[PDB]
Amino acid sequence: QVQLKQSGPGLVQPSQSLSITCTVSGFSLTTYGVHWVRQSPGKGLEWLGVMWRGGSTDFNAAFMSRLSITKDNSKSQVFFKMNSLQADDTAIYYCARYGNYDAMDYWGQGTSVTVSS
Amino acid sequence: SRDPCPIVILNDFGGAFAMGAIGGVVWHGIKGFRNSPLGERGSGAMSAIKARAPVLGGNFGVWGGLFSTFDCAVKAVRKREDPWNAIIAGFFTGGALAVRGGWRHTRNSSITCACLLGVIEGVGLMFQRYAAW
Amino acid sequence: QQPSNWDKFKMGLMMGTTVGVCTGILFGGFAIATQGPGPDGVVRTLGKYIAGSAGTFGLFMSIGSII
Amino acid sequence: GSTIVGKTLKKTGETMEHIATKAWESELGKNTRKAAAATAKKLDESFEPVRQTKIYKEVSEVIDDGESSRYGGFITKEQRRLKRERDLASGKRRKITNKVGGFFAETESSRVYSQFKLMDPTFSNESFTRHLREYIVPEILEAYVKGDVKVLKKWFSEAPFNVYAAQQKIFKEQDVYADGRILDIRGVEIVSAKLLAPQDIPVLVVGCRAQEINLYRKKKTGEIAAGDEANILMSSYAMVFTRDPEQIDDDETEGWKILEFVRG
Amino acid sequence: DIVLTQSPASLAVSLGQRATISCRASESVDIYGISFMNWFQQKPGQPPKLLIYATSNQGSGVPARFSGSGSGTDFSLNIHPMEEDDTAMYFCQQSKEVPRTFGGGTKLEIK
Amino acid sequence: SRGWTDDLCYGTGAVYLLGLGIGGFSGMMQGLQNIPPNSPGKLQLNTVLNHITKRGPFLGNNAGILALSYNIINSTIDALRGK
């Protein structure tokens, strides 16, 4: 059936790079897109970036300096990359499929990303 | 080993109608499989077949039968076995088909179908030449 | 030895493909010049014309091989 | 040389034409036409016992149906409304092998048709095409060419109705009003089913062709301001349909909307 | 861009009663006659789940006791029978402009 | 299908032209029955031509497909149902 799974990199050092892989199953990445949404407990939900149906990408204005989203249709994978991590970015990170009328129906397991030393 | 001139016309009409109907079955079956929703693909394909096969059948039947009538007439008048009649009557069938419309429409359709029959007659020589030897 | 239906269908398929190749460039001789590059491209338009003419002639020639 | 022919030749076919109509509208021509009509009704009455045989009636019941509207024909407004209320009374009573194997996979047209099937459990391509041919396109085109804004108020969106109102405002400043007819509409078909947004709003694309005459009359005198009673001109129309999830209980619209309207 | 606001930040209802959540926008999120606002429910240890999309359509598999309505700048969500397993955190999310954003949060419990 | 290329071209063509002619006479009569009250002349020709090309193939193609399907069903089991 339709199912999304994530990697688990956590407990990273400050000012380091983070890379998350979302593996999809049950659909194709060239006919559906992917949203990337984090949920910090102190600032609520927010929106990071999307990879559209057409292959183009988009990011938020406040996080455009360090975001990167790429895709791979053959292995059915979506890669997320943040170059810099600080202490205010301890959160849970999710990837979600968007279908008709831009609805985030099917959501992944979500990874708990912690920043410490 | 062909039929006489006035009685090959109905055979040409029927053959062209059958060719149009079967080609419409394949074409609109693929289209109705492509355009229908997920759960009701077969019903949409069968509805598209039963709605759009006879139009292609009638179109190809009229074109083939009118071309065969003009070919039999130009063979009865010119009284030769040249391939040029297969050009000429085809050109007249262009002038028979798109008459409603305009002068430019008739000219373009007749010239295009004449060029199509000309390249058919150009291609057929190699098949008549190399398949035998 | 005429009555071999597979030979007739094979000959009709081959003749339909060979006339489809010629009708593809026959269609593409003037349409690319009149409509310019188009939304697809120069190569894509002529390739689509060749493929469409080849299919639409090969299918009806395969039907007309038997009839 | 050859360019001077078209001025001289085209008139010479015309000057002999009206004399031919003078031949046709003569007493011999009218008498032969009326006798041809009378003997045509006579032959119709003579072959009416042939047509009234019940085997011919059964084979006509097999053959004849509403699919004649597929091949053309225009519907009068009273007959169109009678057909609508009749149907309402009836209803209310490296090319990898995965690319080859993805022929059964879900496409974007599958998403669009699945959405419109989820909205209404009676939608299909043939049923909507029949409803589009018999009611929607003649109503839209007749209200378009006759200049009636109340019918086009319900169907259009904000942008094409605003464009049409700005178009008609100049004609209101031109002291003229639009008159015309629609003689035949053919080829009402669904071209493609796409999603046209970054938000993935499903849309449908409709194409048709028609025969129309456009002329403008003075509202005071009544003389011709533009156009001709002759010169029947052919046009094509391309429309983009979509559906509102709400107001589906509103009749005379049934939740449909037109986004873009292009005349070619 | 479009700062949203949820009215009942703390809500408690008895069993079988109607609960109403109000979501308000800064501007109008209407496009082509349709309002692009969706509703999300999050369990205390789960990823969020879609409930209502395009303000009048139920999500896949969502029971019929969740309803949504409203337009312009004001939208509302109604649960007329209250069940004991519907204790969660509720969000409203707009989907018109490019900077997508989510609401504050609503805690819903049973006395 | 097994083919046999006989009693199929003749059966389809001889009823296709028959139905086309019957539709032609019926469409000419029905177009003549709905002449406009005014006389621009050319518009009468356009009306009757649109009427005849509407009426014709609708009475042709149905008879053609009916005879073709009947002949296909017959010739599929013509030699397979001798008993």
mmCIF file of N, CA, C and O in Angstrom, chain D residues 76-111:
data_model
loop_
_atom_site.group_PDB
_atom_site.id
_atom_site.type_symbol
_atom_site.label_atom_id
_atom_site.label_comp_id
_atom_site.label_asym_id
_atom_site.label_seq_id
_atom_site.Cartn_x
_atom_site.Cartn_y
_atom_site.Cartn_z
ATOM 1 N N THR D 76 -33.504 24.167 -30.544
ATOM 2 C CA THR D 76 -34.200 25.384 -30.158
ATOM 3 C C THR D 76 -34.316 25.456 -28.639
ATOM 4 O O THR D 76 -34.260 24.440 -27.940
ATOM 5 N N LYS D 77 -34.475 26.685 -28.134
ATOM 6 C CA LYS D 77 -34.433 26.927 -26.693
ATOM 7 C C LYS D 77 -35.616 26.289 -25.974
ATOM 8 O O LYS D 77 -35.455 25.729 -24.881
ATOM 9 N N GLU D 78 -36.808 26.357 -26.574
ATOM 10 C CA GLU D 78 -37.972 25.706 -25.984
ATOM 11 C C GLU D 78 -37.811 24.189 -25.968
ATOM 12 O O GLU D 78 -38.124 23.541 -24.963
ATOM 13 N N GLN D 79 -37.281 23.613 -27.051
ATOM 14 C CA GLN D 79 -37.042 22.174 -27.084
ATOM 15 C C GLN D 79 -35.914 21.771 -26.145
ATOM 16 O O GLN D 79 -35.963 20.687 -25.558
ATOM 17 N N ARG D 80 -34.909 22.636 -25.978
ATOM 18 C CA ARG D 80 -33.824 22.351 -25.044
ATOM 19 C C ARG D 80 -34.315 22.352 -23.600
ATOM 20 O O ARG D 80 -33.963 21.458 -22.817
ATOM 21 N N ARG D 81 -35.152 23.329 -23.235
ATOM 22 C CA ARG D 81 -35.712 23.352 -21.886
ATOM 23 C C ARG D 81 -36.698 22.214 -21.667
ATOM 24 O O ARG D 81 -36.777 21.672 -20.556
ATOM 25 N N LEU D 82 -37.444 21.834 -22.710
ATOM 26 C CA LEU D 82 -38.332 20.680 -22.618
ATOM 27 C C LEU D 82 -37.545 19.388 -22.423
ATOM 28 O O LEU D 82 -37.959 18.518 -21.652
ATOM 29 N N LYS D 83 -36.400 19.258 -23.100
ATOM 30 C CA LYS D 83 -35.540 18.095 -22.907
ATOM 31 C C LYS D 83 -34.946 18.070 -21.505
ATOM 32 O O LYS D 83 -34.842 16.999 -20.891
ATOM 33 N N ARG D 84 -34.555 19.241 -20.986
ATOM 34 C CA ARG D 84 -34.011 19.316 -19.632
ATOM 35 C C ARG D 84 -35.053 18.925 -18.588
ATOM 36 O O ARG D 84 -34.765 18.126 -17.688
ATOM 37 N N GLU D 85 -36.280 19.436 -18.719
ATOM 38 C CA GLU D 85 -37.309 19.078 -17.747
ATOM 39 C C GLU D 85 -37.797 17.645 -17.945
ATOM 40 O O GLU D 85 -38.229 17.008 -16.980
ATOM 41 N N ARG D 86 -37.685 17.104 -19.166
ATOM 42 C CA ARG D 86 -38.001 15.697 -19.395
ATOM 43 C C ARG D 86 -36.996 14.784 -18.707
ATOM 44 O O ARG D 86 -37.380 13.791 -18.075
ATOM 45 N N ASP D 87 -35.704 15.108 -18.814
ATOM 46 C CA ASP D 87 -34.688 14.326 -18.117
ATOM 47 C C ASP D 87 -34.784 14.492 -16.607
ATOM 48 O O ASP D 87 -34.521 13.537 -15.866
ATOM 49 N N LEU D 88 -35.169 15.683 -16.133
ATOM 50 C CA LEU D 88 -35.391 15.877 -14.702
ATOM 51 C C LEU D 88 -36.583 15.067 -14.205
ATOM 52 O O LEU D 88 -36.544 14.516 -13.098
ATOM 53 N N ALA D 89 -37.650 14.983 -15.006
ATOM 54 C CA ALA D 89 -38.798 14.163 -14.637
ATOM 55 C C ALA D 89 -38.469 12.676 -14.676
ATOM 56 O O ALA D 89 -39.008 11.905 -13.875
ATOM 57 N N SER D 90 -37.605 12.257 -15.603
ATOM 58 C CA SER D 90 -37.198 10.855 -15.653
ATOM 59 C C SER D 90 -36.300 10.494 -14.475
ATOM 60 O O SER D 90 -36.458 9.425 -13.874
ATOM 61 N N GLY D 91 -35.350 11.368 -14.135
ATOM 62 C CA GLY D 91 -34.448 11.078 -13.032
ATOM 63 C C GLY D 91 -35.113 11.184 -11.672
ATOM 64 O O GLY D 91 -34.836 10.387 -10.772
ATOM 65 N N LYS D 92 -36.002 12.164 -11.504
ATOM 66 C CA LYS D 92 -36.650 12.395 -10.220
ATOM 67 C C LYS D 92 -37.801 11.436 -9.945
ATOM 68 O O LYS D 92 -38.305 11.414 -8.817
ATOM 69 N N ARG D 93 -38.229 10.656 -10.932
ATOM 70 C CA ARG D 93 -39.321 9.707 -10.739
ATOM 71 C C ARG D 93 -38.867 8.504 -9.919
ATOM 72 O O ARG D 93 -38.396 7.508 -10.468
ATOM 73 N N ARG D 94 17.675 4.746 -22.151
ATOM 74 C CA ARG D 94 17.390 3.388 -21.706
ATOM 75 C C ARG D 94 15.925 3.242 -21.312
ATOM 76 O O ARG D 94 15.536 3.584 -20.195
ATOM 77 N N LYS D 95 15.111 2.739 -22.237
ATOM 78 C CA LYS D 95 13.695 2.496 -21.971
ATOM 79 C C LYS D 95 13.573 1.195 -21.191
ATOM 80 O O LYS D 95 13.632 0.104 -21.763
ATOM 81 N N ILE D 96 13.401 1.309 -19.876
ATOM 82 C CA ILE D 96 13.327 0.135 -19.019
ATOM 83 C C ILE D 96 11.955 -0.519 -19.156
ATOM 84 O O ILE D 96 10.998 0.073 -19.660
ATOM 85 N N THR D 97 11.863 -1.771 -18.698
ATOM 86 C CA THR D 97 10.605 -2.510 -18.731
ATOM 87 C C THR D 97 9.595 -2.008 -17.707
ATOM 88 O O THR D 97 8.414 -2.357 -17.807
ATOM 89 N N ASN D 98 10.030 -1.208 -16.728
ATOM 90 C CA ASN D 98 9.095 -0.611 -15.781
ATOM 91 C C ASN D 98 8.211 0.435 -16.448
ATOM 92 O O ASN D 98 7.050 0.601 -16.057
ATOM 93 N N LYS D 99 8.734 1.137 -17.459
ATOM 94 C CA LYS D 99 7.906 2.056 -18.235
ATOM 95 C C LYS D 99 6.836 1.308 -19.019
ATOM 96 O O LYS D 99 5.726 1.818 -19.207
ATOM 97 N N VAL D 100 7.156 0.101 -19.492
ATOM 98 C CA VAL D 100 6.163 -0.730 -20.164
ATOM 99 C C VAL D 100 5.141 -1.262 -19.166
ATOM 100 O O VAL D 100 3.939 -1.321 -19.456
ATOM 101 N N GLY D 101 5.597 -1.657 -17.975
ATOM 102 C CA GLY D 101 4.705 -2.179 -16.955
ATOM 103 C C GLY D 101 3.891 -1.143 -16.209
ATOM 104 O O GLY D 101 2.968 -1.511 -15.477
ATOM 105 N N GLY D 102 4.208 0.138 -16.377
ATOM 106 C CA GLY D 102 3.446 1.200 -15.747
ATOM 107 C C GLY D 102 2.248 1.668 -16.549
ATOM 108 O O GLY D 102 1.706 2.747 -16.294
ATOM 109 N N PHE D 103 1.841 0.869 -17.538
ATOM 110 C CA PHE D 103 0.629 1.162 -18.294
ATOM 111 C C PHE D 103 -0.618 1.028 -17.429
ATOM 112 O O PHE D 103 -1.612 1.724 -17.662
ATOM 113 N N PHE D 104 -0.586 0.144 -16.435
ATOM 114 C CA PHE D 104 -1.670 -0.013 -15.477
ATOM 115 C C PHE D 104 -1.503 0.874 -14.248
ATOM 116 O O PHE D 104 -2.353 0.834 -13.353
ATOM 117 N N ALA D 105 -0.432 1.659 -14.178
ATOM 118 C CA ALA D 105 -0.196 2.535 -13.042
ATOM 119 C C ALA D 105 -1.088 3.772 -13.123
ATOM 120 O O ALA D 105 -1.712 4.060 -14.146
ATOM 121 N N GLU D 106 -1.139 4.511 -12.021
ATOM 122 C CA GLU D 106 -2.009 5.674 -11.931
ATOM 123 C C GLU D 106 -1.376 6.878 -12.616
ATOM 124 O O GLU D 106 -0.194 7.170 -12.424
ATOM 125 N N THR D 107 -2.174 7.580 -13.409
ATOM 126 C CA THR D 107 -1.745 8.765 -14.137
ATOM 127 C C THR D 107 -2.460 9.986 -13.568
ATOM 128 O O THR D 107 -3.213 9.892 -12.597
ATOM 129 N N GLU D 108 -2.218 11.144 -14.179
ATOM 130 C CA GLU D 108 -2.874 12.359 -13.714
ATOM 131 C C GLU D 108 -4.341 12.407 -14.130
ATOM 132 O O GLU D 108 -5.178 12.929 -13.378
ATOM 133 N N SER D 109 -4.677 11.844 -15.295
ATOM 134 C CA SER D 109 -6.074 11.764 -15.702
ATOM 135 C C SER D 109 -6.855 10.816 -14.808
ATOM 136 O O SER D 109 -8.048 11.037 -14.566
ATOM 137 N N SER D 110 -6.192 9.777 -14.293
ATOM 138 C CA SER D 110 -6.820 8.909 -13.307
ATOM 139 C C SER D 110 -7.128 9.666 -12.023
ATOM 140 O O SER D 110 -8.185 9.460 -11.421
ATOM 141 N N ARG D 111 -6.230 10.566 -11.606
ATOM 142 C CA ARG D 111 -6.488 11.390 -10.426
ATOM 143 C C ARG D 111 -7.663 12.332 -10.644
ATOM 144 O O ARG D 111 -8.518 12.478 -9.759
#
